Write a protein that binds this ligand. Structure first.
Ligand code: FES
Ligand SMILES: [K+]
Ligand SMILES: [Mg+2]
Ligand SMILES: [Mg+2]
Ligand SMILES: [Zn+2]
Lengths: 75, 99, 38, 40, 161, 100, 177, 38, 43, 162, 43
């Protein structure tokens, strides 16, 4: 289990890592399923583009937003 | 070695002191410590315990207002929990969103 | 009185009574049947 | 305190995480000019 | 005719806490507007004395007032005498009123300025580790850069609407 | 008539939100003590031929009785009153720093 | 407050006198309230080395009430130090011997186990009856609310309250009762 | 250590003790006690 | 009186450890996380 | 209810029985489908030892319990009320339901000890001389386990062992 | 019958004198919480 945690880049706790949802990866995740939390990455505004690469933020809901204004919502 | 390890205890003890002082101030207004800290967070007031303890000593009128605000938010929680969703959100329960 | 973990009535006249926080078997006809809860 | 509540609003469990409290500039020059970006 | 849920009064028929009836939201919205207008007029007419503010700076919060000193535990990349604005104000308080950010007050509402007055280093901090019976001992001395700031002024503007 | 806290001891708290809802305004004027709730300050406290004299009945007490009197007067234990040795007396900083 | 420095310091660190009524109250709840006040934990300026504890006056300690069968079951153990000096007495026996011991012992055990404890105990004034010395009475500032609400006896209910409670069943008319 | 089968009830590892505690049978509770209905 | 033979938490006779309410809640909290992990690994 | 009078006149004894006024159940119970007095008024889990107004309706003039066949209570509620009355007597909340004393009997002065939530009879309980270790502590019972299901308005459950 | 100032003290005489000082500070505009001196560059 120690070895697989290193392979998945999960050495530091509470640090989200993105992995492909494929059988091979899932096979590793299942060995250490009791040590981790798995959530789906959600893309409400689609994938980041080259223009907005630097303005992304991963929220606690799992949604990766491509605009991060740090402003209140006028709505 | 003692001086080195004492740096951990200083931070720990400092925070135990603030909680004791905040608890005392809250009880003067009929509020328990967890109700004040918990409900202030729900109002998006991010004042830390160090500042709260200082306010209790040197800004007692502001602290009563903070205690009143926490108490108001606490009562709104109860009304919401009692309701079946018919009621609109409390005036002080509305959360300011940041996008 | 003989101490007993399990109290049993030994005749029809035996009667179970709880006194001073413990069960007793009392018998007027045969006082030898008297038992105390242990 | 409040970690679970913050998560329910789509915020970081710890208020030191993402958001205006942490990410916004701490200070600026009194004349208006913005400060160099913070190292963190 | 008793109601379907009527319970005769007993020690456990109802909860110990008193019943609380919150104000009507429509009526309270009008009362809130009155309170805000009253406090705004106090600002316009200057009916306040010394102000204090809670400002987030260098990861931590400082309750500050004019003429104060605060010791920042790091270098701020500012020359001595340079004046700066503290942009993260959680609270500004007066004798008769207090304004609370959610979590931060708008920059239009309050302006806190400060001046760098000293750039120095802390006294030496001993770092020593020791484990008995293991020939394990090490001593390190660290001095941390510090910056002293003077709070020059806390000013509020009548921008409560 | 709803009030989050009683308003009769320290200040009259009024909580309000701005129209945008981003600022909490707290109006808290001080409550003055009513005159009715005060007491009057107790100002009220022969043919002697001989001038009155101020006689100081010092009546110096022994250590034990003296310590008993002091401990009772200030509601403390006896221990605080006993002396300390030179080692401790000379370690005390007689010019301590003063914050303000 | 615009007070001179010395009067300001005097006011903040002053000793308040509290009155507590022990009648029908469990000693533990009385002790919990007294412990906070004697230590100063009810003050926002509290610090262990500030010596900011207050005075607590507890009256009617003879009329304290234990829940359950603690009168019979709770034992206070002491040892004279001599061989055979171990002594164990029930709460009932101790109460009849010393009408303040129970409240005193509950408080003593709740205070911090340090050298300040016996100093705090000097600021505790226990009286078995309503009588309080005149000097102690003149310095009192505030009475603390009794921690336990005393239940009303059936003879203390007003006829309005009795009438308000419905009759729940109809007894047989020919029952002797 | 002791063998897997003992004459006494062997003490469990604390994690197993917790496992047992969390997986105890919980009986279905009716909204209204059936004795309170016709 | 009330001695535990030998060392407390080893051997044949041990000090009994009891499961507190919050110890139970802690375990159930992590059981819920793992149950969800199962779901997201199913697709 | 029915009273009985024994009058001896002219060296002759005449035993009679008269029917006195009988109280009636209050009209319109909120839960007519209830099968016992308690659940007919939605009182299940909502009464305690100090609710003398409730308890006093099910006891005899001298403090004794009434039969379950007469009151109509169910076994569960009858047992709860029976224990509650014992605690009410021991707490001193029923001063007008004292035992009948034969003529010429005046109880001696006994030490007054205020108590409440007393499960056992004071005389039948022994001192806890040996408390035991923390992991095997002998506890002092408070209240009754029969009332464990009472409505709890606090987040902590009732502690029945102190 | 309107409160102008209040002062603490260890004696009634000391408390009264302090109350007079508090009243004088309020009358003259030298209250502890008065507006701080403005050191900003004159406009
Ligand atoms: S029938 Fe409802 S509680 Fe007895
Ligand atoms: K062992
Ligand atoms: Mg083995
Ligand atoms: Mg051992
Ligand atoms: Zn027999």
């Amino acid at each position: 289990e120690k070895d697989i945690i290193k392979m998945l880049g999960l050495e530091k706790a509470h640090t989200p890592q993105v992995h492909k949802n494929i059988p091979s990866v899932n096979a590793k995740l299942k060995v250490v399923k009791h040590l981790i939390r798995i959530k789906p990455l959600k893309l409400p505004q689609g994938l980041p583009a080259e223009e907005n690469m630097s303005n992304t933020c991963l929220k606690s809901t799992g949604e990766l937003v491509v605009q991060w204004h740090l402003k209140p919502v006028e709505q | 070695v003692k001086c080195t390890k004492a740096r951990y205890l200083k931070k720990k003890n400092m925070r135990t002191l603030w909680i004791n002082r905040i608890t005392a101030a809250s009880q003067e207004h009929g509020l328990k410590y967890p109700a004040l800290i918990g409900n202030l967070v729900k109002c998006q007031v991010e004042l830390n315990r160090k500042v709260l303890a200082d306010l209790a000593i040197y800004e007692p009128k502001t602290f009563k207002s903070l205690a009143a605000l926490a108490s108001r938010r606490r009562h709104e929680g109860f009304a919401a929990a009692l309701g079946d969703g018919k009621e609109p959100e409390g005036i002080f329960s509305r959360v300011v969103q940041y996008h | 009185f003989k101490n007993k973990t399990v109290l049993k009535k030994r005749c029809k006249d035996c009667y179970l009574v709880k006194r001073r926080g413990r069960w007793y078997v009392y018998c007027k006809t045969h006082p030898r049947h008297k038992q105390r809860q242990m | 305190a409040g970690g679970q509540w913050r998560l329910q609003q789509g915020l970081a469990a710890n208020p030191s995480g993402y958001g205006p409290l942490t990410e916004l500039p701490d200070w600026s020059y009194a004349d208006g000019r913005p400060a160099p970006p913070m190292k963190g | 005719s008793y109601l379907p849920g009527y319970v005769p009064k007993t020690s456990l028929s109802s909860p110990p806490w008193p019943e609380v009836v919150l104000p009507d939201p429509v009526e309270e919205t009008r009362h809130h507007a009155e309170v805000v207008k009253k406090v705004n007029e106090m600002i316009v007419t200057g009916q306040y004395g010394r102000l204090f503010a809670v400002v987030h700076f260098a990861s931590r919060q400082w309750k500050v007032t004019s003429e104060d000193l605060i010791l920042i535990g790091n270098e701020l990349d500012l020359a001595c005498g340079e004046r700066i604005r503290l942009e993260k104000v959680l609270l500004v308080g007066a004798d008769n009123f207090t304004l609370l950010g959610k979590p931060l007050l708008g920059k239009d509402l309050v302006r806190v300025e400060a001046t760098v007055i000293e750039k120095t280093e802390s006294w030496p901090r001993i770092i020593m580790r020791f484990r008995k019976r293991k020939n394990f001992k090490k001593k390190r001395i660290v001095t941390t850069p510090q910056t002293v700031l003077r709070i020059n002024s806390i000013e509020i503007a009548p921008c409560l609407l | 008539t709803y009030s989050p806290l009683p308003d009769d001891y320290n200040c009259n708290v009024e909580l309000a939100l701005t129209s945008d809802g981003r600022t909490i305004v707290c109006y808290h004027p001080s409550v003055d003590i009513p005159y009715e709730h005060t007491k009057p300050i107790p100002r009220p406290d022969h043919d002697q031929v001989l001038k009155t004299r101020l006689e100081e009945k010092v009546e110096h007490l022994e250590e034990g009785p003296m310590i008993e009197q002091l401990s009772k007067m200030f509601f403390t234990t006896k221990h605080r009153w006993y002396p300390h040795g030179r080692y401790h007396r000379c370690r005390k900083n007689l010019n301590p720093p003063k914050d303000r | 407050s615009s007070f001179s420095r010395a009067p300001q310091q005097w006011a903040t660190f002053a000793r308040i006198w509290y009155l507590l009524d022990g009648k029908m109250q469990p000693p533990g709840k009385l002790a919990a309230m007294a412990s906070i006040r004697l230590q100063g934990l009810h003050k926002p300026v509290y610090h262990a080395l500030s010596d900011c504890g207050d005075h607590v006056v507890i009256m009617n300690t003879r009329h304290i009430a234990f829940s359950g069968n603690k009168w019979e079951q709770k034992v206070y153990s002491s040892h004279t130090g001599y061989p055979g000096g171990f002594r164990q007495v029930t709460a009932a026996q101790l109460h009849l011997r010393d009408p303040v011991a129970i409240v005193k012992l509950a408080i003593y055990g709740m205070l911090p186990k340090n050298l300040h404890r016996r100093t705090m105990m000097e600021r505790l004034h226990l009286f078995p009856d309503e009588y309080i010395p005149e000097d102690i009475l003149k310095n009192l500032v505030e009475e603390l609310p009794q921690p336990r609400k005393i239940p009303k006896r059936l003879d203390e209910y007003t006829q309005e309250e009795i009438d308000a409670f419905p009759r729940l069943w109809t007894p047989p008319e020919d029952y002797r009762l | 250590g002791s063998k897997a089968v003992t004459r006494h009830r062997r003490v469990m590892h604390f994690q197993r003790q917790k496992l047992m505690a969390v997986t105890e049978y919980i009986p279905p509770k009716p909204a209204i006690h059936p004795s309170c209905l016709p | 009186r009330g001695r535990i033979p030998g060392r407390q938490w080893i051997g044949k006779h041990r000090r009994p450890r009891f499961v507190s309410l919050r110890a139970k809640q802690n375990m159930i909290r992590r059981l819920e996380i793992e149950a969800e992990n199962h779901y997201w690994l199913s697709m | 209810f029915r009273e009985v009078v024994e009058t001896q006149e002219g060296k002759t004894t005449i035993i009679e029985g008269r029917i006195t006024a009988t109280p009636k159940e209050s009209p319109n119970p909120p839960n007519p489908s209830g099968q016992c007095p308690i659940c007919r008024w939605n009182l299940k889990h909502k009464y305690n030892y100090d609710d003398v107004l409730l308890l006093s309706q099910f006891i005899r003039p001298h403090g004794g319990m009434l039969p379950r066949k007469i009151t109509g209570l169910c076994q569960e509620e009858h047992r709860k009320i029976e224990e509650c009355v014992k605690m009410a007597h021991r707490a001193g909340l029923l001063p007008n339901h004292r035992p009948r004393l034969p003529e010429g009997v005046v109880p001696k002065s006994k030490p007054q000890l205020n108590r409440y939530l007393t499960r056992w009879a004071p005389g039948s309980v022994k001192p806890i001389y040996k408390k035991g270790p923390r992991w095997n502590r002998v506890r002092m019972p408070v209240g009754s386990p029969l009332l464990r299901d009472n409505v709890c308005y606090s987040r902590t459950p009732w502690k029945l062992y102190h | 019958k309107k409160l102008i100032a209040e002062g603490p003290g260890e004696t009634v005489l000391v408390a009264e004198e302090e109350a007079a000082r508090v009243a004088l500070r309020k009358l003259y505009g030298f209250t502890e919480n008065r507006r701080p001196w403005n050191y900003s560059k004159p406009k």
